[PDB]
Every structure is written in C-alpha cells, then in structure tokens.
Short mmCIF file of C-alpha atoms and ligand atoms in Angstrom, two decimals:
data_model
loop_
_atom_site.label_atom_id
_atom_site.label_comp_id
_atom_site.label_asym_id
_atom_site.label_seq_id
_atom_site.Cartn_x
_atom_site.Cartn_y
_atom_site.Cartn_z
CA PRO A 11 -16.56 14.88 -10.57
CA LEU A 12 -14.21 14.68 -7.59
CA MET A 13 -14.56 12.61 -4.38
CA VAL A 14 -11.97 11.99 -1.65
CA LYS A 15 -12.09 8.94 0.61
CA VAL A 16 -9.77 8.36 3.54
CA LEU A 17 -9.33 5.13 5.55
CA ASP A 18 -7.44 4.26 8.77
CA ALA A 19 -5.22 1.19 8.64
CA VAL A 20 -4.61 1.14 12.42
CA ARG A 21 -8.23 1.03 13.57
CA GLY A 22 -9.74 -0.53 10.48
CA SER A 23 -12.19 2.24 9.97
CA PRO A 24 -13.03 5.23 7.88
CA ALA A 25 -10.93 8.25 8.78
CA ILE A 26 -13.63 10.58 10.05
CA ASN A 27 -13.50 14.38 10.32
CA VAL A 28 -10.23 14.68 8.42
CA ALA A 29 -9.63 18.10 6.82
CA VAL A 30 -9.01 18.06 3.10
CA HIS A 31 -7.98 21.00 0.96
CA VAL A 32 -7.92 21.03 -2.83
CA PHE A 33 -5.84 23.53 -4.79
CA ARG A 34 -5.57 24.30 -8.50
CA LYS A 35 -2.22 25.27 -10.03
CA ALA A 36 -2.40 28.87 -11.31
CA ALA A 37 -0.67 30.33 -14.31
CA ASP A 38 2.12 31.68 -12.10
CA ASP A 39 2.74 28.20 -10.70
CA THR A 40 1.23 28.98 -7.33
CA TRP A 41 -1.36 26.80 -5.62
CA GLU A 42 -4.74 28.49 -5.52
CA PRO A 43 -7.49 27.36 -3.12
CA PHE A 44 -10.17 25.47 -4.96
CA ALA A 45 -12.38 23.42 -2.49
CA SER A 46 -12.25 22.01 0.99
CA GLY A 47 -14.16 20.09 3.60
CA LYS A 48 -13.98 17.37 6.21
CA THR A 49 -14.54 13.64 5.67
CA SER A 50 -17.84 12.21 6.84
CA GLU A 51 -18.64 9.23 8.97
CA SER A 52 -17.96 7.03 5.93
CA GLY A 53 -14.54 8.58 5.39
CA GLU A 54 -15.86 10.28 2.23
CA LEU A 55 -15.94 13.87 1.16
CA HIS A 56 -18.59 14.61 -1.46
CA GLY A 57 -19.69 17.80 -3.11
CA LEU A 58 -16.29 19.47 -3.41
CA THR A 59 -16.94 20.85 -6.91
CA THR A 60 -19.07 20.72 -9.99
CA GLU A 61 -18.42 19.67 -13.54
CA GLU A 62 -18.55 23.34 -14.62
CA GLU A 63 -15.81 24.36 -12.15
CA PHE A 64 -13.50 21.33 -12.51
CA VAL A 65 -11.64 22.21 -15.63
CA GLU A 66 -8.49 20.53 -16.92
CA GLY A 67 -5.38 21.40 -14.95
CA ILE A 68 -3.11 20.28 -12.18
CA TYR A 69 -4.71 19.81 -8.78
CA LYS A 70 -3.37 19.08 -5.33
CA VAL A 71 -5.38 17.30 -2.64
CA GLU A 72 -3.91 17.93 0.79
CA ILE A 73 -5.09 15.65 3.59
CA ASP A 74 -4.46 16.81 7.17
CA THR A 75 -3.20 13.53 8.45
CA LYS A 76 -1.20 15.04 11.28
CA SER A 77 -4.25 16.52 13.06
CA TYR A 78 -6.10 13.25 12.47
CA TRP A 79 -3.50 11.18 14.28
CA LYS A 80 -2.98 13.70 17.08
CA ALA A 81 -6.74 13.72 17.79
CA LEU A 82 -6.46 9.96 18.37
CA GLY A 83 -3.49 10.36 20.62
CA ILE A 84 -0.97 9.01 18.12
CA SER A 85 2.34 10.61 17.06
CA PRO A 86 2.56 10.65 13.32
CA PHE A 87 5.42 11.00 10.95
CA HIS A 88 4.12 13.15 8.12
CA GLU A 89 3.02 16.77 8.15
CA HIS A 90 0.19 15.94 5.73
CA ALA A 91 -0.41 13.79 2.71
CA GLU A 92 -0.43 15.35 -0.70
CA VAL A 93 -1.84 13.97 -3.91
CA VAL A 94 -0.98 15.93 -7.05
CA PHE A 95 -2.42 14.98 -10.44
CA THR A 96 -3.67 16.29 -13.77
CA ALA A 97 -7.38 16.28 -14.61
CA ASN A 98 -7.70 15.31 -18.31
CA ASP A 99 -10.96 15.54 -20.27
CA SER A 100 -9.73 12.74 -22.64
CA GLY A 101 -10.02 10.28 -19.73
CA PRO A 102 -13.08 9.26 -17.70
CA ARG A 103 -15.10 11.87 -16.04
CA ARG A 104 -15.29 10.97 -12.35
CA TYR A 105 -12.29 10.93 -10.04
CA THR A 106 -12.06 9.29 -6.64
CA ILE A 107 -8.89 9.99 -4.74
CA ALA A 108 -8.55 7.33 -2.02
CA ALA A 109 -5.97 7.29 0.78
CA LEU A 110 -5.12 4.67 3.39
CA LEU A 111 -3.36 6.05 6.46
CA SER A 112 -0.92 4.69 9.02
CA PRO A 113 1.19 6.73 11.41
CA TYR A 114 4.42 6.27 9.40
CA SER A 115 2.96 5.43 5.98
CA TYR A 116 0.23 6.20 3.54
CA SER A 117 -1.02 4.81 0.27
CA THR A 118 -3.14 6.54 -2.35
CA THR A 119 -4.88 5.47 -5.53
CA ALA A 120 -7.07 7.02 -8.16
CA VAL A 121 -10.32 5.46 -9.36
CA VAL A 122 -11.26 7.20 -12.60
CA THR A 123 -14.54 6.13 -14.23
CA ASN A 124 -17.32 7.20 -16.54
CA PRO B 11 -22.20 -8.14 6.96
CA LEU B 12 -19.42 -8.83 4.45
CA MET B 13 -18.47 -6.87 1.30
CA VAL B 14 -15.38 -7.23 -0.90
CA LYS B 15 -14.07 -4.39 -3.05
CA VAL B 16 -11.20 -4.71 -5.50
CA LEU B 17 -9.35 -1.88 -7.29
CA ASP B 18 -6.74 -1.79 -10.09
CA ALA B 19 -3.67 0.36 -9.47
CA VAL B 20 -2.41 0.08 -13.07
CA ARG B 21 -5.52 1.36 -14.85
CA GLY B 22 -6.95 3.43 -12.04
CA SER B 23 -10.23 1.66 -12.06
CA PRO B 24 -12.39 -0.81 -10.25
CA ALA B 25 -11.30 -4.39 -10.85
CA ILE B 26 -14.34 -5.71 -12.66
CA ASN B 27 -15.45 -9.34 -13.02
CA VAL B 28 -12.87 -10.66 -10.58
CA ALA B 29 -13.74 -14.04 -9.00
CA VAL B 30 -13.82 -14.09 -5.22
CA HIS B 31 -14.24 -17.14 -3.03
CA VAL B 32 -14.88 -17.06 0.70
CA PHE B 33 -14.14 -20.06 2.93
CA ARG B 34 -14.82 -20.75 6.60
CA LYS B 35 -12.31 -22.74 8.68
CA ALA B 36 -13.92 -26.03 9.78
CA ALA B 37 -13.34 -27.89 13.01
CA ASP B 38 -10.81 -30.17 11.29
CA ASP B 39 -8.83 -27.15 10.14
CA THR B 40 -9.88 -27.48 6.52
CA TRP B 41 -11.24 -24.61 4.45
CA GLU B 42 -14.92 -25.08 3.69
CA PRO B 43 -16.65 -23.16 0.87
CA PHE B 44 -18.82 -20.43 2.26
CA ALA B 45 -19.74 -17.84 -0.51
CA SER B 46 -18.52 -16.66 -3.86
CA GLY B 47 -19.18 -14.29 -6.71
CA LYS B 48 -17.64 -11.87 -9.16
CA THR B 49 -17.00 -8.16 -8.61
CA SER B 50 -19.36 -5.74 -10.31
CA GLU B 51 -18.72 -2.73 -12.45
CA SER B 52 -17.90 -0.79 -9.27
CA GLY B 53 -15.36 -3.38 -8.18
CA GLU B 54 -17.71 -4.44 -5.37
CA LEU B 55 -19.18 -7.76 -4.43
CA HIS B 56 -22.35 -7.49 -2.36
CA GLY B 57 -24.73 -10.08 -1.03
CA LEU B 58 -22.20 -12.77 -0.18
CA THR B 59 -23.89 -13.75 3.10
CA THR B 60 -26.37 -12.81 5.75
CA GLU B 61 -26.06 -11.93 9.40
CA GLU B 62 -27.60 -15.32 10.31
CA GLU B 63 -24.96 -17.27 8.34
CA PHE B 64 -21.88 -15.17 9.21
CA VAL B 65 -21.01 -16.54 12.59
CA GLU B 66 -17.77 -15.96 14.48
CA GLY B 67 -14.82 -17.88 13.07
CA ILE B 68 -11.85 -17.68 10.79
CA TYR B 69 -12.57 -16.81 7.17
CA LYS B 70 -10.46 -16.67 4.04
CA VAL B 71 -11.24 -14.40 1.09
CA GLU B 72 -9.48 -15.61 -2.04
CA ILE B 73 -9.30 -13.15 -4.93
CA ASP B 74 -8.47 -14.56 -8.38
CA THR B 75 -5.97 -11.93 -9.30
CA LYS B 76 -4.12 -14.12 -11.77
CA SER B 77 -7.12 -14.55 -14.12
CA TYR B 78 -7.84 -10.83 -13.77
CA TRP B 79 -4.42 -9.80 -15.02
CA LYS B 80 -4.28 -12.43 -17.76
CA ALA B 81 -7.63 -11.22 -19.13
CA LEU B 82 -6.01 -7.79 -19.53
CA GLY B 83 -2.99 -9.23 -21.23
CA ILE B 84 -0.66 -8.73 -18.27
CA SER B 85 1.67 -11.31 -16.68
CA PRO B 86 1.19 -11.30 -12.97
CA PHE B 87 3.30 -12.52 -10.13
CA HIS B 88 0.87 -14.02 -7.65
CA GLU B 89 -1.36 -17.06 -8.00
CA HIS B 90 -4.13 -15.25 -6.10
CA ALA B 91 -4.51 -12.93 -3.17
CA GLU B 92 -5.66 -14.29 0.13
CA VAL B 93 -7.08 -12.42 3.08
CA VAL B 94 -7.50 -14.45 6.26
CA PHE B 95 -9.13 -12.97 9.37
CA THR B 96 -11.32 -13.68 12.38
CA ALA B 97 -14.90 -12.41 12.54
CA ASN B 98 -15.53 -11.27 16.14
CA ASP B 99 -18.98 -10.33 17.48
CA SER B 100 -17.33 -8.03 20.12
CA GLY B 101 -16.25 -5.71 17.28
CA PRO B 102 -18.38 -3.79 14.76
CA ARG B 103 -20.83 -5.62 12.69
CA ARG B 104 -20.04 -4.82 9.05
CA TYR B 105 -16.83 -5.87 7.32
CA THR B 106 -15.46 -4.50 4.08
CA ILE B 107 -12.42 -6.29 2.75
CA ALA B 108 -10.73 -3.98 0.22
CA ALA B 109 -7.83 -4.89 -2.06
CA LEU B 110 -5.69 -2.79 -4.40
CA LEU B 111 -3.97 -4.78 -7.14
CA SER B 112 -0.80 -4.39 -9.18
CA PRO B 113 0.90 -7.10 -11.21
CA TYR B 114 3.67 -7.68 -8.64
CA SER B 115 2.00 -6.29 -5.52
CA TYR B 116 -1.22 -6.03 -3.63
CA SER B 117 -2.50 -4.20 -0.59
CA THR B 118 -5.51 -5.03 1.55
CA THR B 119 -7.34 -3.35 4.40
CA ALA B 120 -10.35 -3.99 6.54
CA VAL B 121 -13.06 -1.39 7.18
CA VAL B 122 -15.09 -2.62 10.14
CA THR B 123 -18.06 -0.46 11.19
CA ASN B 124 -21.40 -0.47 12.93
CA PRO C 11 17.55 -16.85 -3.83
CA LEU C 12 14.70 -16.00 -1.46
CA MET C 13 14.62 -13.09 1.03
CA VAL C 14 11.70 -11.79 3.08
CA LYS C 15 11.62 -8.22 4.47
CA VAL C 16 8.97 -6.87 6.79
CA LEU C 17 8.40 -3.27 7.92
CA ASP C 18 6.07 -1.77 10.54
CA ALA C 19 3.95 1.16 9.38
CA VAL C 20 2.87 2.14 12.93
CA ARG C 21 6.33 2.36 14.48
CA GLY C 22 8.22 3.38 11.40
CA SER C 23 10.70 0.61 11.90
CA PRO C 24 11.67 -2.85 10.71
CA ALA C 25 9.30 -5.56 11.96
CA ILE C 26 11.62 -7.58 14.11
CA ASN C 27 11.12 -11.23 15.13
CA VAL C 28 8.38 -11.90 12.62
CA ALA C 29 7.93 -15.68 12.01
CA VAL C 30 7.82 -16.72 8.37
CA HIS C 31 6.88 -20.16 7.04
CA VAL C 32 7.44 -21.14 3.41
CA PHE C 33 5.58 -24.03 1.80
CA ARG C 34 5.86 -25.63 -1.65
CA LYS C 35 2.90 -27.27 -3.38
CA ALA C 36 3.46 -31.03 -3.62
CA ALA C 37 2.51 -33.51 -6.31
CA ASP C 38 -0.64 -34.35 -4.40
CA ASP C 39 -1.62 -30.71 -4.17
CA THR C 40 -0.84 -30.24 -0.51
CA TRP C 41 1.34 -27.53 1.02
CA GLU C 42 4.60 -29.18 2.03
CA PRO C 43 6.81 -27.35 4.57
CA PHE C 44 9.80 -25.93 2.73
CA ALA C 45 11.56 -23.53 5.06
CA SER C 46 11.02 -21.16 7.95
CA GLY C 47 12.70 -18.46 9.98
CA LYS C 48 12.36 -15.14 11.81
CA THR C 49 13.12 -11.59 10.68
CA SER C 50 16.21 -10.02 12.18
CA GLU C 51 16.69 -6.57 13.71
CA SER C 52 16.79 -5.18 10.15
CA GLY C 53 13.42 -6.72 9.36
CA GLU C 54 15.13 -9.10 6.93
CA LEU C 55 15.13 -12.90 6.79
CA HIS C 56 18.06 -14.34 4.88
CA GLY C 57 19.21 -17.91 4.44
CA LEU C 58 15.84 -19.63 3.97
CA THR C 59 17.03 -21.82 1.11
CA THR C 60 19.65 -22.60 -1.43
CA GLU C 61 19.67 -22.47 -5.25
CA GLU C 62 19.82 -26.28 -5.30
CA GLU C 63 16.81 -26.66 -3.08
CA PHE C 64 14.70 -23.83 -4.49
CA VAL C 65 13.44 -25.64 -7.53
CA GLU C 66 10.53 -24.71 -9.73
CA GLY C 67 7.20 -24.85 -8.00
CA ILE C 68 4.29 -22.95 -6.46
CA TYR C 69 5.41 -21.43 -3.17
CA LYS C 70 3.53 -19.92 -0.27
CA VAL C 71 5.23 -17.44 2.03
CA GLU C 72 3.21 -17.14 5.22
CA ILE C 73 4.10 -14.11 7.31
CA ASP C 74 2.81 -14.53 10.85
CA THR C 75 1.45 -11.04 11.34
CA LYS C 76 -1.03 -11.93 14.13
CA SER C 77 1.72 -13.43 16.23
CA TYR C 78 3.82 -10.31 15.59
CA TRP C 79 1.15 -7.81 16.67
CA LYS C 80 0.03 -9.93 19.67
CA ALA C 81 3.63 -10.08 20.89
CA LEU C 82 3.47 -6.27 20.88
CA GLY C 83 0.25 -6.42 22.84
CA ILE C 84 -1.99 -5.32 19.96
CA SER C 85 -5.12 -7.16 18.71
CA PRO C 86 -4.84 -7.22 14.90
CA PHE C 87 -7.32 -8.09 12.19
CA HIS C 88 -5.60 -10.69 10.00
CA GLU C 89 -4.39 -14.15 10.91
CA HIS C 90 -1.33 -13.89 8.68
CA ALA C 91 -0.32 -12.59 5.29
CA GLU C 92 0.16 -15.16 2.57
CA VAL C 93 2.07 -14.60 -0.60
CA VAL C 94 1.60 -17.35 -3.22
CA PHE C 95 3.54 -17.42 -6.47
CA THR C 96 5.13 -19.67 -9.09
CA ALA C 97 8.95 -19.50 -8.87
CA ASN C 98 11.79 -20.44 -11.17
CA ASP C 99 9.65 -21.52 -14.10
CA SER C 100 11.90 -19.80 -16.62
CA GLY C 101 15.03 -20.75 -14.77
CA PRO C 102 16.48 -19.59 -11.47
CA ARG C 103 15.52 -16.12 -10.21
CA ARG C 104 16.10 -14.25 -6.98
CA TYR C 105 13.05 -13.18 -5.10
CA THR C 106 12.53 -10.59 -2.40
CA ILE C 107 9.12 -10.68 -0.78
CA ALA C 108 8.54 -7.39 1.07
CA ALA C 109 5.64 -6.62 3.37
CA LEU C 110 4.46 -3.49 5.20
CA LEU C 111 2.23 -4.09 8.21
CA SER C 112 -0.47 -2.21 10.12
CA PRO C 113 -2.94 -3.74 12.56
CA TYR C 114 -5.83 -3.75 10.07
CA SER C 115 -3.91 -3.72 6.77
CA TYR C 116 -0.89 -4.99 4.93
CA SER C 117 0.77 -4.63 1.62
CA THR C 118 3.20 -6.87 -0.15
CA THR C 119 5.43 -6.60 -3.23
CA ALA C 120 7.94 -8.78 -5.02
CA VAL C 121 11.32 -7.85 -6.44
CA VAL C 122 12.42 -10.49 -8.93
CA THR C 123 15.94 -10.38 -10.41
CA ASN C 124 17.87 -12.59 -12.78
CA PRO C 125 21.40 -13.21 -11.62
CA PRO D 11 21.19 10.11 7.45
CA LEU D 12 18.69 10.19 4.58
CA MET D 13 18.09 7.40 2.02
CA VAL D 14 15.32 7.09 -0.56
CA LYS D 15 14.31 3.71 -2.04
CA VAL D 16 11.81 3.25 -4.85
CA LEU D 17 10.29 0.02 -6.18
CA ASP D 18 8.10 -0.69 -9.22
CA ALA D 19 4.95 -2.71 -8.55
CA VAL D 20 4.26 -3.39 -12.26
CA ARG D 21 7.67 -4.80 -13.18
CA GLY D 22 8.52 -6.29 -9.83
CA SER D 23 11.83 -4.53 -9.79
CA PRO D 24 13.67 -1.56 -8.35
CA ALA D 25 12.61 1.75 -9.91
CA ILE D 26 15.82 2.81 -11.55
CA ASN D 27 16.77 6.38 -12.52
CA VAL D 28 14.00 8.00 -10.53
CA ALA D 29 14.74 11.73 -9.89
CA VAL D 30 14.34 12.87 -6.30
CA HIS D 31 14.38 16.46 -5.05
CA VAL D 32 14.57 17.32 -1.35
CA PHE D 33 13.52 20.71 -0.02
CA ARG D 34 13.70 22.23 3.48
CA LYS D 35 11.20 24.82 4.70
CA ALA D 36 12.94 28.18 5.16
CA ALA D 37 12.41 30.91 7.70
CA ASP D 38 10.12 32.71 5.29
CA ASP D 39 8.04 29.60 4.77
CA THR D 40 9.26 28.78 1.29
CA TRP D 41 10.64 25.44 0.10
CA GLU D 42 14.39 25.88 -0.26
CA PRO D 43 16.28 23.34 -2.42
CA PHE D 44 18.24 21.06 -0.11
CA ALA D 45 19.48 18.14 -2.16
CA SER D 46 18.71 15.99 -5.17
CA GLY D 47 19.72 12.82 -6.95
CA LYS D 48 18.62 9.76 -8.91
CA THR D 49 17.94 6.19 -7.78
CA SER D 50 20.54 3.63 -8.75
CA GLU D 51 20.10 0.17 -10.28
CA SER D 52 19.08 -1.06 -6.80
CA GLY D 53 16.35 1.54 -6.58
CA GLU D 54 18.28 3.29 -3.81
CA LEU D 55 19.54 6.87 -3.56
CA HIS D 56 22.38 7.31 -1.11
CA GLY D 57 24.56 10.29 -0.35
CA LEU D 58 21.93 13.06 -0.44
CA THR D 59 23.26 14.81 2.65
CA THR D 60 25.48 14.75 5.65
CA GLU D 61 24.78 14.74 9.40
CA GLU D 62 26.18 18.28 9.60
CA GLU D 63 23.92 19.57 6.88
CA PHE D 64 20.77 17.66 7.80
CA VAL D 65 19.66 19.89 10.62
CA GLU D 66 16.27 20.05 12.24
CA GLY D 67 13.55 21.24 9.94
CA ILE D 68 10.50 20.38 7.84
CA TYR D 69 11.61 18.47 4.76
CA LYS D 70 9.88 17.59 1.52
CA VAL D 71 11.04 14.62 -0.51
CA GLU D 72 9.65 14.91 -4.02
CA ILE D 73 9.83 11.69 -6.01
CA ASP D 74 9.41 12.40 -9.71
CA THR D 75 7.07 9.55 -10.54
CA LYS D 76 5.58 11.14 -13.70
CA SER D 77 9.01 11.57 -15.23
CA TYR D 78 9.79 7.95 -14.32
CA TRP D 79 6.67 6.45 -15.94
CA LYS D 80 6.89 8.73 -19.02
CA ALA D 81 10.48 7.63 -19.58
CA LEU D 82 9.06 4.09 -19.71
CA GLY D 83 6.48 5.25 -22.21
CA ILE D 84 3.53 5.05 -19.82
CA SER D 85 1.02 7.87 -19.09
CA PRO D 86 0.61 7.95 -15.30
CA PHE D 87 -1.88 9.69 -13.04
CA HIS D 88 0.20 11.63 -10.51
CA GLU D 89 2.63 14.45 -11.07
CA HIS D 90 4.98 13.26 -8.34
CA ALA D 91 4.87 11.80 -4.87
CA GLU D 92 5.69 14.15 -2.02
CA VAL D 93 6.69 13.07 1.42
CA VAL D 94 6.71 15.90 4.00
CA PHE D 95 7.95 15.42 7.55
CA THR D 96 9.70 17.09 10.47
CA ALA D 97 13.22 15.64 10.94
CA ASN D 98 15.74 15.65 13.74
CA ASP D 99 13.60 17.47 16.27
CA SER D 100 14.65 15.19 19.10
CA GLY D 101 18.19 14.97 17.87
CA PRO D 102 19.75 13.29 14.86
CA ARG D 103 17.92 10.31 13.33
CA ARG D 104 18.41 8.25 10.20
CA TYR D 105 15.57 8.20 7.77
CA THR D 106 14.71 5.85 4.95
CA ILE D 107 11.87 7.03 2.74
CA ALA D 108 10.57 4.07 0.72
CA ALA D 109 8.04 4.25 -2.09
CA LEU D 110 6.23 1.63 -4.20
CA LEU D 111 4.91 2.85 -7.54
CA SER D 112 2.12 1.92 -9.97
CA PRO D 113 0.79 4.11 -12.76
CA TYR D 114 -2.33 5.17 -10.83
CA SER D 115 -1.16 4.60 -7.24
CA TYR D 116 1.73 4.84 -4.85
CA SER D 117 2.55 4.05 -1.30
CA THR D 118 5.23 5.41 0.94
CA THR D 119 6.65 4.50 4.36
CA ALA D 120 9.38 5.76 6.64
CA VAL D 121 11.94 3.81 8.61
CA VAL D 122 13.39 6.00 11.34
CA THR D 123 16.35 4.77 13.42
CA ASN D 124 18.45 6.27 16.17
CA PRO D 125 22.13 5.64 15.68
O1 DZ2 E 201 -9.33 0.40 -2.16
C1 DZ2 E 201 -8.88 1.12 -1.28
N1 DZ2 E 201 -9.67 1.83 -0.58
C2 DZ2 E 201 -10.94 2.01 -0.84
C3 DZ2 E 201 -11.30 2.85 -1.88
C4 DZ2 E 201 -12.64 3.06 -2.09
BR1 DZ2 E 201 -13.02 4.18 -3.54
C5 DZ2 E 201 -13.66 2.50 -1.32
O2 DZ2 E 201 -14.98 2.71 -1.59
C6 DZ2 E 201 -13.25 1.66 -0.29
BR2 DZ2 E 201 -14.50 0.83 0.86
C7 DZ2 E 201 -11.91 1.42 -0.04
C8 DZ2 E 201 -7.42 1.08 -0.87
C9 DZ2 E 201 -6.93 -0.14 -0.49
C10 DZ2 E 201 -5.69 -0.33 -0.10
CL1 DZ2 E 201 -5.34 -1.93 0.37
C11 DZ2 E 201 -4.77 0.66 -0.14
C12 DZ2 E 201 -5.20 1.93 -0.57
C13 DZ2 E 201 -6.52 2.17 -0.93
CL2 DZ2 E 201 -6.94 3.78 -1.37
O1 DZ2 E 202 9.52 -0.53 -0.60
C1 DZ2 E 202 8.93 -1.14 0.30
N1 DZ2 E 202 9.58 -1.72 1.23
C2 DZ2 E 202 10.88 -1.92 1.22
C3 DZ2 E 202 11.37 -3.02 0.54
C4 DZ2 E 202 12.73 -3.25 0.54
BR1 DZ2 E 202 13.22 -4.75 -0.47
C5 DZ2 E 202 13.65 -2.50 1.26
O2 DZ2 E 202 14.99 -2.73 1.24
C6 DZ2 E 202 13.12 -1.39 1.95
BR2 DZ2 E 202 14.19 -0.21 2.96
C7 DZ2 E 202 11.77 -1.10 1.91
C8 DZ2 E 202 7.40 -1.11 0.44
C9 DZ2 E 202 6.87 0.15 0.43
C10 DZ2 E 202 5.58 0.42 0.53
CL1 DZ2 E 202 5.28 2.11 0.54
C11 DZ2 E 202 4.66 -0.59 0.65
C12 DZ2 E 202 5.15 -1.93 0.67
C13 DZ2 E 202 6.51 -2.21 0.59
CL2 DZ2 E 202 7.00 -3.85 0.64
#
C-alpha cells in the first residue's frame, strides 16, 4: 500500500540508490522504525510494507538526499527530506509518495488511489 | 519514446482525462501537430509516437489544464501548461514529461532514460 | 501590475539576468509583443508595464530558461518556460509570476492581488 | 538572517497566518526550540532571530501546513513541512526558506546570500 518514488531535477533522471526510511509515530510520540530500502533504477522503492502492517497512523518518510547529492559530487542544502502524513482508511488504499530533488529545493506530492 | 504523466496536487491523484497535444516545430517556425490523446486512469498517456517518427527537433507538449480544473468545478489561473524542449539523439532514448498541477501553479520535469 | 521573479534551485540563489518576454494575444489570434526585460540581482523584474497599458487580455510570459542555463555553461532540457493566463477580466489586478528553475525542471506559481 | 515565506498554490495568494516553529539540534541530539512565529499578510515571517543568536548548527524549520489548511476548512495530506539544514558553517549567511503549498503537495527552496 506504500510506494516511494524519487526523481532528480538536475540530471533529468530517476534518483537511483537513494536510502529511504519510514517511521511510524508511537504512542509516546517517538518515531519508531517501520520500513526501509533504497530506490531502484527506476527511482522507485516497492515492497516496503503490506496491507496487514500498514495500519492507520502518522508516518514519516525520510529520504537521504544529502548522501545522494554528495555521491554525485554536488553540495546540497538539506540534511534530508522528510514527508510526514496520516494514513486514513476512509481514503483510497494505495499511497505513492513522490519527491523531486534539486540541490537547494525539493517538491513532494501524494498520489492516493484505489 | 515519449510518455506524458499528469498529477493533481489538490486531490492527490492522477489527473485523469486531461487532453494533451504534442507539436513539432517546422522549418518555418510554426508549430505542426504531431500527436495527441487524453491521460488514462493512471494519469499517463502512452503510445503517442514511435521511435521512427520521433526525430530530433523542438517539441511542445500542451496540457489542457484549464478544462481539467473546470470539469472539477475549480477556477484556474492558466490557459494551459506548455512544455517546450529539444529531443537530442546524443542523450537517452526515452522521455517522460511529468506535470504536477494546482489551480494557480504547475511544476514539470523530464525523466530521460535508456 | 506585473512582476516576474525567478529563483535558481541548484545554486540556492536568485536567477539573475534572466530574459523575459511578455506577449498579448491580438485580435487575429497572434502573439503580439507586449513587454520585455531582464531579472535583476534580486531575481525580480519590475517595471514591465503600466496599469493603463495592461488591459484585459490573454498574456504569455516567456522566461528564457535555456539562455539562462547556457550562459552558466549548462546544457538544459527546456527551451523556455511559458506562463499563459487571462488577466484583468474582472478589473485590474496585480500579478506576480514566480518561477523556480533546475536544468531539467521548473515550477511556476502566480500571486494575484486586488489593490 | 532567517526569513520564511509561504505561498498558496490553490488561491494564488500568500499563505497568511501560517505557524512556523524553528528548532536547533542540541548537543544531546534533541531538537531544541529556537524560535517561532506566524506569516503575515504578505506570506512572510520576519524577525525570527538575530545574527548573535543564529549560530552555527543544524536547524529545522517546521511549517504547520495541516493547521493552515484545516483553518481554511480543508482536509490536507501532510502533517507539516519540515526543512532541515546546516546553517552558518562557513560563517554567517542569510537564509530565506520559501514554500508553496497545495492540499496534497508542497515544494520548498532556499535562497542563501552572503552579506
Ligand atoms: O509527478 C511527479 N513525479 C512523478 C510521480 C510519479 Br508517481 C511518476 O510515476 C513519475 Br514518472 C513522476 C512530480 C512532478 C513534479 Cl513537476 C514535481 C514533483 C513530482 Cl513528485
Ligand atoms: O515561493 C516561491 N518563490 C518565491 C516567490 C516569491 Br513572489 C518570493 O518573494 C520569494 Br523569496 C520566493 C516558490 C517556491 C517553490 Cl518551493 C516553488 C516555486 C516558487 Cl515560484
């Protein structure tokens, strides 16, 4: 039910081999590790979770943009990019979190479908 | 070699049934019709052209954003969104033109891969 | 009543010396030159027009992104960024057209205010 | 040396009355409150800090987008938008953090200048 896709606005390409960590907000308001992986050749990260595991709650998707840029020899501004949202069962069932990266900027959107 | 994908930043969804027209710049500097279609349920428009037809040159992708918004009952700012670029055989071979729409704003990127 | 601002997402800076051409759709359906200028050191282009001159119409703001990137020695994807909109059709408004540039991407937004 | 500007991509306007909280990473690795404020009618938030106070460090600028959209009666996707960056590590700089909001999307950029 959750896919992350990352694109590079400088090169006009997927952002490949970018680390992504997903956390779930715990009862005590801390961020608990939930899923992680690295984007593929298409800039996509599939298979993070299952429907059974992905219960309603607040999630954070942290994208390691800084390591991405440094690997390409580029000095970036941000430490990482964070996307924090609530999963709601009343809405559609599949979530794509997309991010478009530049050294000093990023954009993100949600594509939420059934 | 050419795909167009359109997303809606207000609803968090693909932008479905959006008209898209592609033109090629002619020798006389006019814009000649090249391909067209409507985005699918995934927000994607496939099958616009073939490798044989998609020669180097300047192309314009016009996205009918105004009709899209009006169909949803929303007053938009722009008449359309235009994306104008050069296809270059020295670069990778497959082009995805992606656009993210809001009533008063849009973003576009190119994903160019082999 | 019309201002254009351009920022550079690679440098984290204003986009300086960006050429901008504004056209207005004529009776015969052609794009008539209306005004032009260059962004300043702040990334802003002021003084394009006047409230008398900026009548109702369909306007095109062409931001010469290719020229900008090439002048920096970069080979970018797009020829330019065009922003096309109807203006002043419910009386005079002030318009800021903002753009944020990367070599293979751009975004644009409008800020529309009623004086 | 720190300014936050927020625009609304739905309305085509500044995003007014947006709450912003700035944190600085402490020695123990926690996010310490540093400053906070609200955007004005221009969408701008000035006066967060001073050059004395804005020392080197890792800063987080939290823009309370959910609160903004809810106050407008809209149900948005994100909780907030966070912008996290190292500041002043090669001496004092001025930073503008700009954001452009839609209910299911946002973008952010930095303008960094050396006075
Ligand atoms: O639609 C966007 N990216 C995108 C999102 C998905 Br889902 C895709 O399958 C592809 Br191809 C591209 C996008 C576009 C801009 Cl102009 C800014 C931000 C995003 Cl995330
Ligand atoms: O708010 C934006 N730019 C901007 C627009 C204006 Br008008 C300014 O005075 C400043 Br300072 C910045 C913007 C931000 C993103 Cl993240 C994407 C596109 C734009 Cl035009």
